[PDB]
Write a protein that binds this ligand. Structure first.
Ligand SMILES: Cc1cc2nc3c(=O)[nH]c(=O)nc-3n(C[C@H](O)[C@H](O)[C@H](O)COP(=O)(O)OP(=O)(O)OC[C@H]3O[C@@H](n4cnc5c(N)ncnc54)[C@H](O)[C@@H]3O)c2cc1C
Ligand SMILES: NC(=O)C1=CN([C@@H]2O[C@H](COP(=O)(O)OP(=O)(O)OC[C@H]3O[C@@H](n4cnc5c(N)ncnc54)[C@H](O)[C@@H]3O)[C@@H](O)[C@H]2O)C=CC1
Ligand SMILES: NC(=O)C1=CN([C@@H]2O[C@H](COP(=O)(O)OP(=O)(O)OC[C@H]3O[C@@H](n4cnc5c(N)ncnc54)[C@H](O)[C@@H]3O)[C@@H](O)[C@H]2O)C=CC1
Ligand code: NA
Ligand code: NA
Length: 279
C-alpha cells in the first residue's frame, strides 16, 4: 500500500518563470507503481530557506527582479506535507518528475508568509534528498474509445503530460487526442519538444499553445488569448459532436470555470468533464 521513498534530486531546473521541474531518482532504481493523473506527497522537515539562494536562470529572472521576489524567506518550524502530480508517465521508470509553481505571497498582501512547501522545493539542488510517499490518485483516464481533449494552463501541466504520454506510449492508443495549453508568454512554455515530437509521430495527436499575455520579445504569431476561447474558435465550435468527447483539464480556477461554462453550453454532459483541482 502506501510506501515511502527517500529520493535523490537529479535536477530542479526552471521550465518557466515560476515553475521548476523537480526530477527525483527512486532508490535502487525502483519505480513508483502510479497511474497517469496520480500524485505523490512530498514531506519536509522544519527548515529555513531564502529565495536569494534559489537557482533562477537569467532568462527567467525578469519578473523576479521586477516584483523583488528574492526578498522572500520561509521559516517552517513544523513538518509539512503536500501533494504533487506526476509529470512523468508510468514507463518513465526509476524517476518521479514534478512541475512545482512557486507560491509567492499575493501582490495585495506582499508581507504574508511565502508558500511553505513550494519554497522548500525551490531550495533543493542536485544531490539533495527529498522524501515522497504514495502513489495516490483519482484523476484517471476513462477506458473508452472516445475522442480526448486535454486542456491545461500554467502550472497544471504535469498530469496533462503524464496522461498524454501514457496513452500514446504505454497504451499505444489510437484514440483521437488533442492538447490545448494556455501559457502567459513564450518563455512560460515548456515540454515543447516532448509534445512536438509526439504530434509528429502520431497522426492521432495534435497540440496547440495559446499565449494570453505575449511579450514584445516573443515575436509571436500564434494563437492568443485565453485557451478556452482558442479551443472554441479553432476546433470545438465547428465540431459535429463535442458532447461525444471526454475533456480532461488542469489549470487555474478561472480557466476551469471558463472551460466548464463553454462545454456545458455546447451540450457536454458532466460525465465527460474531468478536472484536477489542486485546491
Ligand atoms: C492532488 C493534488 C495535486 C497537486 N499537484 C500540484 C502540481 O502538480 N503542481 C503544483 O505546483 N501544485 C500542485 N498541488 C498544490 C500543492 O499541493 C500545494 O498546495 C502548493 O504547492 C502550495 O503549497 P505551499 O505549501 O507552497 O503554500 P501554502 O503555504 O499552502 O500557501 C499557499 C499560498 O497562501 C499564501 N498565504 C500565506 N499566508 C497567507 C495569508 N495570511 N493571507 C493570504 N495568503 C497567505 C502563501 O504565500 C501562498 O501563496 C497539488 C495539490 C493536490 C491536492
Ligand atoms: N508566483 C507566481 O506565480 C507569480 C506570478 N506572477 C504573474 O506574473 C505576471 C506579471 O505581469 P506583468 O505584465 O509582468 O506585470 P504587472 O505589474 O502588469 O502584473 C500584473 C499583476 O501581477 C500581479 N502579481 C502576481 N503575483 C505577484 C507578486 N508576487 N508580486 C507582485 N505582483 C504580483 C499583481 O497583482 C499585478 O496586478 C502576472 O500574471 C502575475 O500574476 C508574478 C509574480 C509571481
Ligand atoms: N489545477 C489547479 O487547481 C491549478 C491551479 N492553479 C492556480 O491558478 C493560479 C494561476 O496559476 P498560473 O500557473 O500562474 O497561471 P497563469 O496565470 O499563467 O494562467 C495560465 C493560463 O490559464 C488561462 N487563464 C488564466 N486566467 C484566466 C481567466 N481569468 N480566464 C480564462 N482563462 C484564464 C490562460 O490560458 C493562461 O494562459 C495560481 O493561484 C495557481 O495556484 C494553476 C494551475 C493549476
Ligand atoms: Na520555458
Ligand atoms: Na499528429
Amino acid at each position: 500500500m502506501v510506501k515511502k521513498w527517500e529520493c535523490t534530486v537529479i535536477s530542479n531546473d526552471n521550465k518557466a518563470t515560476f515553475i521548476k521541474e523537480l526530477k527525483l531518482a527512486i532508490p535502487d532504481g525502483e519505480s513508483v507503481p502510479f497511474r497517469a493523473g496520480g500524485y505523490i506527497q512530498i514531506e519536509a522537515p522544519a527548515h529555513h530557506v531564502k529565495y536569494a539562494d534559489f537557482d533562477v536562470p537569467e532568462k527567467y529572472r525578469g519578473d523576479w527582479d521586477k516584483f523583488n521576489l528574492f526578498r522572500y524567506e520561509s521559516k517552517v518550524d513544523e513538518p509539512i506535507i503536500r501533494a504533487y502530480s506526476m509529470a512523468n508517465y508510468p514507463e518513465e521508470f526509476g524517476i518521479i518528475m514534478l512541475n512545482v509553481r512557486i507560491a509567492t505571497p499575493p501582490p495585495n498582501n506582499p508581507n504574508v508568509p511565502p508558500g511553505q512547501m513550494s519554497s522548500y522545493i525551490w531550495s533543493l539542488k542536485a544531490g539533495d534528498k527529498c522524501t515522497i510517499s504514495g502513489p495516490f490518485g483519482e484523476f484517471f483516464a476513462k477506458d473508452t474509445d472516445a475522442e480526448m481533449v486535454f486542456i491545461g494552463g500554467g502550472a497544471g501541466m504535469a498530469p496533462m503530460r503524464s496522461h498524454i504520454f501514457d496513452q500514446l506510449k504505454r497504451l499505444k492508443s489510437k484514440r483521437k487526442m488533442s492538447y490545448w495549453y494556455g501559457a502567459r508568454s513564450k518563455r512560460e512554455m515548456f515540454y515543447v519538444e516532448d509534445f512536438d515530437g509526439l504530434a509528429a509521430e502520431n497522426d492521432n495527436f495534435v497540440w496547440h499553445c495559446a499565449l494570453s499575455d505575449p511579450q514584445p520579445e516573443d515575436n509571436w504569431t500564434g494563437y492568443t488569448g485565453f485557451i478556452h476561447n482558442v479551443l472554441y474558435e479553432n476546433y470545438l465550435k465547428d465540431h459535429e459532436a463535442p458532447e461525444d468527447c471526454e475533456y480532461y483539464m488542469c489549470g487555474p480556477p478561472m480557466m476551469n470555470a471558463a472551460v466548464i461554462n463553454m462545454l456545458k453550453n455546447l451540450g457536454v454532459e458532466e460525465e465527460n468533464i474531468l478536472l484536477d483541482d489542486f485546491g
